[PDB]
Nucleic acid binder design. Structure first.
Ligand code: UDP
Ligand code: BEF
Ligand code: MG
Length: 504
RNA sequence: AAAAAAA
């Protein structure tokens, strides 16, 4: 308790200025960006967030509808109307599930800064992994930022060491893409963070206001966050009807269903090839893959196939953070190209004018389907989406309707010609051992979501394994492994293990 | 070994 709902039933910068809620400095900043007008969530979120009363804020809004400024504008306004207290102390802590999203939010704050130098006094520092710790701390000491954007790990590192120095006067903490940060693997980290910030706060352990933002969340998050929500009441600001699908309606969704999993790649290649020809290389797209190794492999194929027409960018968690930042900014700027990536780029990342979102296989989690396709059709723009799967993945499409009420109308089958298989497979440089590691990674990936997506383990896993045979152009062939490895896999008893591997 | 998450 206590969760108060406010379902989706005009607010303007000028009105907010004249009403006295917002200062001229920030009004100048947002007005100079020349947006047509505040998004519904911003209209529905700003004023309640500044309400000093003892209440937390949960906000659900579809993808690409400007949630970032929905909590950045209030933060800045808060910093304005508290400017003579604690000045050189952190007053707002923003947490994101990925480094690039945190750096993106930082860039948005610096975008706010560049539109009005008067707001630069309210400095900002990002705290993420893959960056020099000392340089960040020197930046912390030098700037005395009022806003911190961070990823949980590095934030915890900093908090364990400098909570007293910087974080004793936090008034706001923000969970962007809250639901993922409230999933297993992140919840304990955020509980430690909230605990430290609350423990270290100068006024009270319940002083801090918490903001939860995402395109995908329900009432379950209210329960999942009960330990990090200090205040007594909690506002639910929803710009989506209960039964309405969370997916952005402007996205033209489709699914390509194949007999086997491997030739969904062939399905995608035929799709992209059709797209570069029709659009005359004026094509900007993001293609998602379930795993790093498969991302890299798929990247190698798309490089062999389409490098002559478009840039092919490889984006995943094993890419050095410097290169991640370089390619996100490049793919942010460039007018065309193919971003080949895992779910690291599924949430939050804002790439202007992405034409299509492609998916080979399923996402690491069901909700990430909504966020994946959310990378296109942003800020009023149009967009389409294609899901490339095999028949044994069909239950996932079934799961999309039962839970999230997501109905993919356009569905079609696919069978590859011998020519494309020969052309693609002949142009693979990877040794059988690499193919083995890649397929093994896919087996591991699909095994971890058997329960979630209601897959038939006895059917889907052998199919994933068969990809090894397909790529080596011998469907009868099975993956060569050792007895210890097969035992280590724990399929020593399962017939599927025998059906999918060959102990050589 | 899955996708994230500083060591
Ligand atoms: O008042 C606004 C705020 C947002 N935007 C658009 O929304 C985008 C921001 O999307 P964001 O990622 O911040 O929202 P989210 O994806 O988190 O829902 C900007 O680039 C703008 O094009 C807009 O048109 N008017
Ligand atoms: F949901 Be938005 F893409 F951050
Ligand atoms: Mg966001």
């Amino acid at each position: 308790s206590k969760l108060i709902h406010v379902p989706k039933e005009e607010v303007t910068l000028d009105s907010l200025l004249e009403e006295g809620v917002l200062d001229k400095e920030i009004h100048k900043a947002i007005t100079r960006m020349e947006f047509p007008g505040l998004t519904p969530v911003q209209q529905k979120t700003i004023k309640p967030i500044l309400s000093s009363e003892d209440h937390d804020v949960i906000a659900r809004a579809k993808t690409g509808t400007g949630k970032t400024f929905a909590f950045l504008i209030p933060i800045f306004q808060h910093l304005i109307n508290t400017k003579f207290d604690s000045q050189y102390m952190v007053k707002a802590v923003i947490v994101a599930p990925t480094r690039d999203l945190a750096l993106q939010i930082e860039a948005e704050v610096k975008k706010i800064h560049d539109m009005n130098y008067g707001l630069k006094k309210y400095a900002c520092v990002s705290l993420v992994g893959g960056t020099d710790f000392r340089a960040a701390m020197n930046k912390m000491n030098k700037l005395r930022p009022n806003i911190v954007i961070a990823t949980p790990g590095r934030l915890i590192d900093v908090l364990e060491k400098y909570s007293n120095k910087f974080f004793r006067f936090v008034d706001y903490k923000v969970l962007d893409e809250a639901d993922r940060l409230l999933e297993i693997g992140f919840r304990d980290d955020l509980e430690t963070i909230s605990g430290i910030l609350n423990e270290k706060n100068s006024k009270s352990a319940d002083n801090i206001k918490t903001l939860l933002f995402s395109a995908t969340l329900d009432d379950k998050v209210q329960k999942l966050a009960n330990n990090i929500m200090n205040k007594k009441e909690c506002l639910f600001l929803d710009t989506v009807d209960k039964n309405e699908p969370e997916a952005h309606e402007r996205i033209d969704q489709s699914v390509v269903i194949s007999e086997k999993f491997a030739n969904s790649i062939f399905a995608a290649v035929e799709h992209i090839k059709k797209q570069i020809k029709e659009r005359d290389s004026n094509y900007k797209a993001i293609i998602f893959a379930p795993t790093v190794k498969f991302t890299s492999f798929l990247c190698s194929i798309l490089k062999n196939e389409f490098k002559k027409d478009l840039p092919i960018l490889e984006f995943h968690g094993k890419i050095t953070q410097n290169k991640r930042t370089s390619l996100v900014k490049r793919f942010k700027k460039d007018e065309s190209g193919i971003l080949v990536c895992t779910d690291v780029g599924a949430r939050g990342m804002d790439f202007p004018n992405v034409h299509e979102v492609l998916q080979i296989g399923v996402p690491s989690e069901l909700a990430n389907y909504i966020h994946r396709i959310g990378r296109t059709a942003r800020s009023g723009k149009e967009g389409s989406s294609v899901l490339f799967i095999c028949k044994d993945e069909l239950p996932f499409v079934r799961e999309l309707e039962d839970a999230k009420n997501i109905v993919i109308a356009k569905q079609e089958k696919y069978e590859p010609s011998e020519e494309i298989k020969s052309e693609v497979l002949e142009a693979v440089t990877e040794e059988p051992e690499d193919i083995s590691d890649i397929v093994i990674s896919l087996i591991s990936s699909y095994r971890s979501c058997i329960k979630e997506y209601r897959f038939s383990e006895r059917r889907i896993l052998p199919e994933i394994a068969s990809t090894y045979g397909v790529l080596l152009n011998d469907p009868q062939l099975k993956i060569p492994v050792s007895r210890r490895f097969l035992d280590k896999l724990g399929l020593s008893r399962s017939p599927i293990g025998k059906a999918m591997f060959e102990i050589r």
